[PDB]
UniProtKB/Swiss-Prot annotation, chains A, B:
Its cofactor is Mg(2+); Mn(2+). Enhanced activity by phosphorylation at pH 7.3 by lowering Km and sensitivity to inhibition by L-malate and L-aspartate, while enhancing activation by glucose 6-phosphate. This is Phosphoenolpyruvate carboxylase 1. It comes from Arabidopsis thaliana. Induction: Upon inorganic phosphate (Pi) deprivation. Transmembrane segments: none annotated. The modification Phosphoserine is found at S657.
Length: 888, 888
């Protein structure tokens, strides 16, 4: 069946570029097949020999072909998964069943625990989404074609029109320039993010909630999940995170807030007329009748011809239509106000004509629901009205709540400008205690701090202006202010005072981000010291959120040491919060790649220490992962299901807590793994050299994914990208070899203890299993070829050392777990080869450079490199990322 | 399987009103079952005995229950038909096959004949739609539930959510007041009409055209139907027909025109952004590149923040997106202009910023298509861009072209006011010749006619003002001006002069409506006399349309005589048009009931005389029929298919022309049938009395369907309604008995001649077959019960006479054709009984009359009749109409 796609696409490729190129693509596929079958490293060079003969444009066409083949492979993969899962006639109903039988838990415990459960998915604009939006659309259409094709109810003409349709849709996808020739603006990032709502999430959320209701009734719970029960929520960083992205200005934040608000209003307004049409009942209780009489009193007997439907004043015969009629008027005026406020700088639309409250909207719908149930119409109320109630209570007046992230040192600079200007010292030079005492005195004091006459840098004025932008805007549009590189309470208090002094009427919660490993070690101490401040503990109102970063941890230290220290961090943070009687919710900055803490969601949730979630979870959805988890109805449902089921199980089925022997064993193991990791990644003075030669790291910024413009000093995203492109995955597995070897060396019974740990400890089981998966996506012959083609003859053995470790480490992993699809790896291998030789040509002086476009080579006329080369490189990176189903 | 619906609905009924009422509904169903099985007329009285015992509100609930049961029966009927037809894995591909094999016709003849074929469906607001819109919505949802239920791919939870959904949707439909408590405005009629576009027709048309392309490729025609090939078009009367509807004012016509324009703009604008997203190509020919450079020149480098997507100036990289970008700007400004022009009286939006031409819109899309095909992207161009091209070329700037219908005598009054005021005579008193000569002199003269100082009646000023309204508005918004009761060229010339003098810049075509039988006899003479006028023949530009009414013909004369005279009328009209070298297209004012010329569409088309269509047809879709032919994707497709296939076959497979013996035989037969019909419907002086007692005719106006406020003097719609409610159908079959009896009497070989005619003449075969169908929907026991309950003891035998004829006539029908589901007739019979006894209670003096609502009896507090009775009567009419699948 894998052959069908090859047939259709290759027929189209032949229809576009002739027999010859189709035949050379087939040759490359056959060489790659002989390689992924026999694994003769001679086959690689055999393939590169055929690859070097290519024309400028021809190699572009080859890279294009294999990349689109990988994409189609992903799409057919998703289709086959959806159908395979559907033809069954963890999981929600299964999780309920296991909670009842295994753990003897009652239905009302599941229901009550469910009501008080919340999962806050926060979408980020992290530059990990390799596929441009113009192509993502065509992918969506194409998987629609393939999904409709996968059925036995096709009529001949339907299938032929879908053949013509899929053919035209592939031909359209291939006819688009895959290369972002300019990097997006943060606004574009926020649009790419929000586009999944008026595509999937908006309609997906109420369907999922219906499904939870159904599953709850399969357990005997006739009651339904409360419409205002916040089982899932959405937050955003798009346009808010300005950490090291100076292009995220205050005006950008204003723009994304106003934008999102306009989107939400528009969606509600388009829903509201259909809802009015259905709410044609005439029975209501005395309450809704009284209110309907109120609205029909101020009915404004006018033409109201701007509407299409219901332009006549609604009669009291159908009172639900009266009340919903006022709801439509207030929606119209809310949309018009937001659209004017966005399109110009201002609006003449009166605020009282609009919904100002998150529940001025909810109130009339709640009333309709009470009336319907009162009058025996709970079936009716649980339909479109309920869907609408859940959409309002879930999305509010601004589809997502925006977080503002900024690094502590910028707040420090602001305060230092203030104290210098006030002739009182230098906040920078001040000790922590001095900062705390001063900040406290200013927060509890009543005199304004700086004035209009404060000297400001562009950076200083950037952060002050972002605070003014936050104050100017509605409170329910924002989420949390995340402080990067937070180390002391002076940073949180600093942001609090900077908010109060920027007249932020309802200041948002402040939350620290500990991402470097030392910050994770020191974090519980800092949180306890913050809670010690009686002022903050009294204003924090018993609730605190703190973010836990996964990107930079496994970058400077061992991936293993990072994971273990994270576990300790969650544990001790919960300890501290309980010690001060504060409800802690921890914010997990997980990525899509395992190297940034990614991997399957239920596995990452089960690997959390027990009694650390307590019905309140928060996870990042990093750029690319959005597409993976919300681009289809089915993906959206499977995502929301995975999250809610994992959290519920982790709530009622607490994972086993580690025996102390396991604690100490992992402490030693963490020392060994850290020394091993840092030994090869930092001690080696020629390591940075070999890295900058052997991996496509430095070229990452060429793809222009995001809007953000030593090895310790690079972002974790291109770090994991480099080693994942080459399918070597060094940062995933490094410390494990020395770790396990030293642990079995110090004691032989530690082998039985590792076997013991792998079978009972969810954290260890998850860790080892993930390492084994990453090994399964590994092939060291690739990194070998890259070394042979690009590394100087000198330090060739260095890589082999690592390669040694690779196999060694794998041998240990399979030994602790007790273990002993393909074909896509064929295409990937081809692109691997293409990526390798092309890099050698790029780092040559002969291939350097010293109107409309009618062919691909004309697409890059400003290339500092040879005409056809830059585009081909970008193509190889994109394609390999697609094949591996991860970018960074 | 019929039992499933009964089970679900009766369970809901029990959940709403208890066991007792469910049990009495079951008793009624059982009595009706014993009646429709055994046909014991004692069973009817047995049922009425149980019916008379009912409470005021209880009988309302019973009528409600049987009516909704009939509706559900209709919906399940449609579902089972759609699935039965789909599980085949006339008709389009079958029609092509028969045209190739049977008639030896070539593909290019089918294709070329198809290109030059046009079918103009014109939706009317005729008050035949019994089901109010608030309920039609719920019906749509309910058939959605049932359609999704009819499958073997249901997952358990899907089926349970659809059970809860169908339950809540039925419960919602039943909880709505079925009674229109106030009659609609013409604007409401036009909304009910147009609502099928942004529901079905808008998306249905391009899908149907794709299907025609597919069928054409199954014959070997790789080419596609031209996007601008006008295979189907839509016109409207809603808000335009003012014949005997004085509530259709000029402001109403303005309103429906502006309204429709706003709807169209909105739909295009919502499509355009998705189209822009897909047209991401970079290759274009020098033409589209030049134009894209033009647009990017005047690009207006601005924020353009009112849009959500593509708010940044579009780069020349993606030229299709540039050109489509200008298209989106001109759409935005067109929508804003129409919305302001509607909501206020005026707009500041510049006209040059909008699409003014029907093809200023089409031009940029045509350019994109040429470019795409030029660059080898015909597959891409035949996708969303083609769908959009067909939508634009098919729907234009105003979704439908509006006809204006008005009776001749009103134009006569206008002209008479003018000639009286000009001290020149009285146009009324003038002979036809004088009218012709004067009208001609004024049309070819250059002096204005009346001035501001013309004395005007409210009627006169109504028609003059409608002409000013037509002149003020865009030309492509209007269709034809239909003249009711047109008899002479003076009427058409009158409208032409009245247009020119009202400064109608681009005057619309004038078309006469001949509906009374004498007008159909005299019509060809009048058309020839009109074409004799050299002026009109020169300005008519070789094209003429004339309407042929079906409503009033079979009302004053025999249904048979009417059909035959219609055939002659089409024939001789075509003769006359060919004689004057003018392309005639005839406009068939067909209804939904056979008594108004309704019946299956392909049968009505085959019954047209040969060489009378010639690739140009025009048919009314009377009120209720709209719902029947466009309320579902499948209904819409089946409608467009039926029409286009019928016209094509009638074009290439001309029906046999009648032998002269058949001609004369039908002339005699028409005399006999006319004498027989008029003998019982007009000669009898007590006939009007018996009619006003035995049928629910007089109560029709109580349903408040439409906005329009002797027996010869009533509308044909309540005429057919009366006899169809009672399932007697007198106007369908009356003259056939005497006709066939006299024809077999004058000669015995005429029996073999009738057998000969039924097997070879499409017109006769259709006629007789239709009569047999109507008989199959007949049961004279019903009319018997109505007579027994409501007719005075005196003229009881009169009806029996008719009843005699009934059987007699049926015996003849089955004899010329050579011939010898049920259960739903059960429910109908119950309502029959309920309708009968209730009428007897209504026409009683004891049951006459000399805040919010918390129960059904409170729903009519102004009833001149007893509290519960009026509503129950309306309910019975609605339900019986639903069961018979026809209103009038």
């Amino acid at each position: 069946y894998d052959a069908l796609l090859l047939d259709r696409f290759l027929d189209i490729l032949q229809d576009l570029h002739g027999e010859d190129l189709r035949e050379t693509v087939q040759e490359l596929y056959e060489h790659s097949a002989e390689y992924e079958g026999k694994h003769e490293p001679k086959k690689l060079e055999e393939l590169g020999s055929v690859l070097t003969s290519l024309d400028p444009g021809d190699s572009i066409v080859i890279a294009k072909a294999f990349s689109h083949m990988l994409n189609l492979a992903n799409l057919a993969e998703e289709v086959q998964i959806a159908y395979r899962r559907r033809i069954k006639k963890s999981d929600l109903e299964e999780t309920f069943k296991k909670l009842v039988g295994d753990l003897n838990k009652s239905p009302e415990e599941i229901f009550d625990a469910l009501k008080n459960q919340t999962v806050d998915l926060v979408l980020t604009a992290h530059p990990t989404q390799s596929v441009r939006r113009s192509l993502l659309q065509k992918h969506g259409r194409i998987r629609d074609c393939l999904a409709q094709l996968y059925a036995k109810d096709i009529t001949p003409d339907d299938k032929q029109e879908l053949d013509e349709a899929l053919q035209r849709e592939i031909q359209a996808a291939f006819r688009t320039d895959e290369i972002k020739r300019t990097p997006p603006t943060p606004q574009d990032e926020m649009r790419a993010g929000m586009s999944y709502f008026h595509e999937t999430i908006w309609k997906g959320v109420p369907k999922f909630l219906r499904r939870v209701d159904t599953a709850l009734k399969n357990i005997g719970i006739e009651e339904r999940v409360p419409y205002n029960a916040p089982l899932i929520q959405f937050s955003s960083w798009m346009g808010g995170d300005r950490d090291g992205n100076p292009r995220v200005t205050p005006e950008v934040t204003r723009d994304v807030c106003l934008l999102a608000r306009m989107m939400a209003a528009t969606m509600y307004f388009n829903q509201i007329e259909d809802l009015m049409f259905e709410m044609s009942m005439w029975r209501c209780n005395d309450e809704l009748r009284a209110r309907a009489d109120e609205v029909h009193a101020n009915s404004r007997k006018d033409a109201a011809k701007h509407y299409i439907e219901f332009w006549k004043s609604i009669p009291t015969t159908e009172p639900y239509r009266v009340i919903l009629g006022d709801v439509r008027d207030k929606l119209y005026h809310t949309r018009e106000r937001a659209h004017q406020l966005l399109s110009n700088g201002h609006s003449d639309v009166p605020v009282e004509a609009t919904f100002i409250n998150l529940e001025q909207f909810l109130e009339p719908l709640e009333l309709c629901y009470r009336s319907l149930c009162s009058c025996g119409d709970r079936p009716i109320a649980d339909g479109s009205l309920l869907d609408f109630l859940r959409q309002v209570s879930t999305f509010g007046l601004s589809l997502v709540r925006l977080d503002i992230r900024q690094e502590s040192d910028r707040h420090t600079d602001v305060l230092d400008a203030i104290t210098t200007h006030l002739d009182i010292g230098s906040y920078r030079e001040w000790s922590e205690e001095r900062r705390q005492e001063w900040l406290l005195s200013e927060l509890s004091g009543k005199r304004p701090l700086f004035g209009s006459d404060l000297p400001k840098t562009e950076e200083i004025a950037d952060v002050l202006d972002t605070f003014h932008v936050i104050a100017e805007l509605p409170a329910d549009s924002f989420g949390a202010y995340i402080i990067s590189m937070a180390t002391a309470p002076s940073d949180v208090l600093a942001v609090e005072l900077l908010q109060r002094e920027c007249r932020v009427k309802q200041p948002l919660r402040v939350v620290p981000l500990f991402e470097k490993l030392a910050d994770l070690e020191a974090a519980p101490a800092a949180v306890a010291r913050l809670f010690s401040v009686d002022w903050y503990k009294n204003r924090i109102n018993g609730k605190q959120e703190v973010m836990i970063g996964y990107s930079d941890s496994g970058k400077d230290a061992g991936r293993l040491s990072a994971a273990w220290q994270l576990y300790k961090a969650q544990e001790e943070l919960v300890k501290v919060a309980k010690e001060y009687g504060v409800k802690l919710t921890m914010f997990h900055g997980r990525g899509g790649t395992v190297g940034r803490g990614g991997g399957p969601t239920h596995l990452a949730i089960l690997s959390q220490p027990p009694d650390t979630i307590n019905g309140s979870l928060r996870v990042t959805v990093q750029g690319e992962v959005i597409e993976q988890s919300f681009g289809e109805e089915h993906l959206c449902f499977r995502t929301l299901q995975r999250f809610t089921a994992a959290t519920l199980e982790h709530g009622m089925r607490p994972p086993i807590s580690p025996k102390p022997e396991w604690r100490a064993l992992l402490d030693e193991m963490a020392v060994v793994a850290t020394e091993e990791y840092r030994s090869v990644v930092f001690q080696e003075p020629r390591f940075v050299e070999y890295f900058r030669l052997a991996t496509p790291e430095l070229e990452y910024g060429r793809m222009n994914i995001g809007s953000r413009p030593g090895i310790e000093s690079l972002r974790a995203i291109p770090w994991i990208f480099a080693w994942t492109q080459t399918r070597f995955h060094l940062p995933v597995w490094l410390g494990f070899g020395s770790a396990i070897r030293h642990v079995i060396e110090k004691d032989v019974r530690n082998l039985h203890m590792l076997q013991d740990m792998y079978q009972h400890w969810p954290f260890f089981r998850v860790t080892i299993d993930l390492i084994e998966m990453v090994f399964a996506k590994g092939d060291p012959g690739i990194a070998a070829l890259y070394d042979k083609l690009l590394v100087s003859e000198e330090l060739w053995p260095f890589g082999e050392k690592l390669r040694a470790n690779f196999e060694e480490t794998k041998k240990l992993i399979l030994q602790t777990a007790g273990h002993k699809l393909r074909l896509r790896d064929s295409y990937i291998t081809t692109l691997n080869v293409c990526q390798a030789y092309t890099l050698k040509r790029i780092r040559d002086p002969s291939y350097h450079v010293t109107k409309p476009a009618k062919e691909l080579i004309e697409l890059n006329p400003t290339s500092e490199y040879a005409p056809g080369l830059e585009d081909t490189l970008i193509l190889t990176m994109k394609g390999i990322a697609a094949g591996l189903q991860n970018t960074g």
